[PDB]
């Protein structure tokens, strides 16, 4: 019940600035799929790694629309520590690299979809995802580390210009769980 | 610890009641007022689904599922009063019996968005623009005496039962997943999300 | 020279209110491959229909080989529904939405079948210069001068500023780019 | 007739002069102010390439390739003076030696955008936001005594020759083709477009 | 039963030397699949045309192996009328052309088997054939035209030197039915 | 016309009897002599299946399903007596419970042929060579006083039930469909062929 | 010239009765392609292993682009089972049948996925010089010396001449081809 | 040492002479007898290529490239004297200008085998059968007073240069790689094999 949410929040609190391994966070989100299933308003269901042989894949149960989610660590720098100009902070190369990587992986998954479907047919696996739209989600860093208003302004300017990639930070990701707990009370 | 055990039961009971009424009258009632009234009483569900504490339905504001009372009766007055709710979500609750795509075909394998759905989208965009204009007018008046809300927009219309084809589903996805600042979620998807929350709690 | 541009403009103004055949306008835009290259700031070069084989074009950046699909309708194509959904709000006409959906579907199919098309080009000796990197599409339909009401223009601008990838451009603006080139030269 | 031919000759001569300057100092001068001065004297080329009559460069505004002398010295004053110039193009000119991608590899075949390019993009976004703020402030003052400009943004930096590898070009395309309100066009692309205009005229 | 066999024999005798249309023989064979089911010792079943989109394709139900059969008309020449040497008659151009055509079609069918199977899966068609072994059958001409001993010797040498293709004349194919009738009696 | 119906009934009854006796002991009776004796009484089925009027079962030759009496007691003497059957089919019948491939794998997905099956193949080839040599010797003696048969070889061993996996079936096909002079047909295939003949007759 | 051939023969005679490592013989045959090219009368060229990507070589015709798949086992591989099915009837050892089936399966798979291989080679800048036209394969295993009895040789010859597409050639036969070449040169 | 070097030089000189003769009149001489005479002086190359020490050029026997002085004048007599040469190479040489496939097309991309090539194949098969019959008759005569050869079959005709389209090459391969007892190798392939041997020696 809600005790499960409290345990998940406790685990998140434990590794806010200690664990920097993408595998641990992938395991955390794979044990509790609803953490990432709560991002999207539309219903989603996790797709097994075998079907589309650190990234995840959630498909709409109705329209089979799949969204590719790439997970970094909360230690991911959102913006460069230095400033491009006075009050101008560039997004750190890790975030842009993650965006490009998730876009490339989504493109490759769309292109090789026929081979994947045929392999699933050969091996008996049912393919319940279709690559209809180039939607992607990147999870990296924490919004808390942006202390200066210039940092927050620069990051918000960066994350508003992206068409398909929807960058969501870990603290804002678990803010949904915390808000669910608050709403229940 | 007992408070959590009571709260989860209360939430499960509320969600069960919502699903019960939905499955009871998913095809009998086609009046927009009825569905708007139904979703007003369960605003915290929408707040969690769309991940925003403040939800705006018709001309009544809500914060965290609690009906905020504004004496002046103006939604814009509350929006200006609370800088916290500068990223609220506008929701239009259309009927579940609202066609999403035209019954005919534009081409072979391509279908066009129905008149009602795109009309509702344009209506919510117009309402967003009017609310922005009213907020700007209030700010201008206050400056005369001595920013921009940019709220989100959501439309809840139709059901996926009418898309009995792969082409229909692909057309609907290519339509709704291309709007920059408007989210379209059908009633069937909404109550599937409610059922998912029920499963999560249990 | 400029006489060619004025002849193109004369053809456009003569056929804008008369012609309703899509093949004629496809031919008109195919004869002058430079007309649609002015839409995109980045350089574009037309790719022959044999390379990647409902009227569509294909312009690819000569540098990055990034391909942009273009769909062409007729200037008589409706933009918004003549009737109004509510008071002062007009729904976009189903023809334009269907065209956007179809161009997106064709871009998806072209990206998915890119391996087969490239291999067929390699077998037939054709050099493939288009690469499907991003899903950008352009729909050309109707004229913006036919929306007289302020509500009409506002509804059409709400629709056209809402799409993520597809860039709806009306014919009058497309030839207005050439007219503006003439004005800048003069 | 003869006037059209004379205009064609003048335009071709101007474009050939621009291309000659570019080829003369494509790899010699790195001063950003130098390229800003060079391009702002040929603003009709930019107006045609970006398909908009009004072009904003630094502190000066250009309409149809003709400099507009705003005696107030403020760009926003001119912008508010002309109601037709609500869709101007804000262009920031950088040196053509600005890198577009990180020289190292973020992953196998994925290259993150360089610091300078995204920094310039954020700088032009900040400039656009400040211009919007100034326009709204001037409108506030006028209302007190008795819209939103939202211009387009364009960044011209770097050359496409440094992106020798296919992965480099794919990464640059996946970066610059997902920005909503910003357009990044390389200097090499700019002058190739100029050569295309020459070929069309000649 | 036997009446059907006699009817088939009468049909074969009627147009034995008059009709020269490949489609007529195609229709006759397609009406009675058992006519070509008796060439192969192992059981075979006809593969529908829509599955592998004048040739046929009979597949072994157990091993899912299909043999490509090319059908000409009985009027098709077997050997050249003139003689390369005294008593030496070359095999006619039609027979070698049919052999090469059927081999090329089998090779293409194998090389494009992935796409065919994938299309069948997408369209709901059950792909019941697997291209395991390169075997083909050509049915061209009549053996009765080879009246001379040199003709029969040359044709037998050519038809026995083939490795993967089993050339069978029409008269042999229908004398198979006649012999079946004799054995039943 | 009535005679044809009676012949059809007789053939159907014979084929039904063969199928019944096969299915009665298709797993219990696994003795080679029993199966050879069963198949001897039903020669004409083998004559039709392999398309040859004359067969060679053990040391006895049958023409058109009829037990041909050879007072010499030698198969080769009869084959010399009648030049008509100079290309008969040599049938050697094994047990239906004969392994076809080794249960262990030679490699990933590749299964070697079982010892019994290749032994049967070598045995039929050896018997064919002995028959050829005896015929040649008889012809040599006749010439001394004052051709070459080259018969067809058939092996009937095992069933397809042991080839459960796809790899087993494909390995068995790549083995049995690589033999020039020998046709390897399983008992299951033989009696499904009998079923097909029954279906054709009906 | 002659020294290289004599050195190859010396290595073969040294390792024939001792070495049982498949990779060693693979390396020996890969060092000198002419050794394995002698099986086919028509000209053949070695295709690099990276082009079409247990131990299998690939030689292709420089003219007709026909490729032959060559499987290499060790000389210690048994040719026939030491026991006998009947008196004088010796079955082929399961290693030989397994090798034949394996090379046939690999050839079938290599043909079936040929288009993907060609596309990968073209996209990676490597020319595809092999064309899978015909199902011809070669299995190299064992030595003919180990067959001493008349029954052994008779059974092995029956098996090796009953094969339709794949030719089984023992190591001593190939290096005896080499020795005969040396003798003819002398 | 020196002996091996001398042998290498002799072989290189012989092969270079053969190549010079071939290239000198690869398109000039079209006489079958001329080419048979040219090849018969260099039969050791054919012995090596076709993997047998004994070559039967028309009616002339050669052992390891050495002429056989058969006083009886019959090839069959020499073949009967030595049971060692039971699988000699039967080489019939045609002109290098012999057509390989008909210039016309049987179908789309299918090129039927030319009359001359299949005629040569039938000729060599008939010659082999007649040699077998003569050997059998000689053995019969010896048995009356007090074996089977089955040799190879080699046909050399035409050149691959007449096959330019890929359909030509595929048709020729699907023809020549389909014969059991006959090997068809073009003149161009034969002399390219000779070139490969030359490269190996050098």
Swiss-Prot record, chains B, D, F, H:
Keywords: Antiviral defense, Hydrolase, Nuclease
Transmembrane segments: none
Coiled-coil boundaries: none
GO aspect biological process, one term: defense response to virus
MF GO annotations: nuclease activity
Keyword Oxidoreductase: no
Task performed by this protein: Only component of antiviral defense system Shedu. Expression of Shedu in B.subtilis (strain BEST7003) confers resistance to phages phi105, phi29, rho14 and to a lesser extent to SPP1. May be an endonuclease.
Protein name (record): Shedu protein SduA
């Amino acid at each position: 019940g809600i005790a499960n949410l409290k345990k998940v929040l406790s685990v998140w609190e434990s590794n806010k600035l200690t664990n920097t391994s993408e595998k641990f966070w992938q395991s955390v989100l794979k044990e509790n799929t609803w953490i990432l299933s709560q991002i999207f308003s539309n219903p989603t269901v996790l797709i097994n790694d075998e079907a589309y042989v650190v990234d995840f894949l959630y498909a709409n149960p109705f329209s089979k629309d799949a969204v590719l989610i790439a997970i970094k660590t909360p230690s991911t720098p959102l913006i460069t520590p230095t400033e491009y100009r006075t009050g101008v902070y560039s997004a750190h190369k890790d975030l842009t690299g993650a965006v490009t990587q998730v876009l490339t992986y989504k493109t490759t998954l769309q292109r090789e979809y026929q081979n994947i479907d045929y392999n699933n047919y050969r091996q008996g696996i049912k393919t319940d995802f279709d690559i209809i739209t180039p939607c992607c989600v990147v999870i990296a860093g924490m919004f808390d580390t942006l202390t200066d208003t210039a940092h927050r302004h620069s990051f918000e300017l960066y994350r508003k210009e992206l068409k398909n990639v929807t960058v969501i930070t870990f603290d804002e990701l678990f803010e949904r769980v915390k808000g669910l707990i608050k709403l229940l009370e």
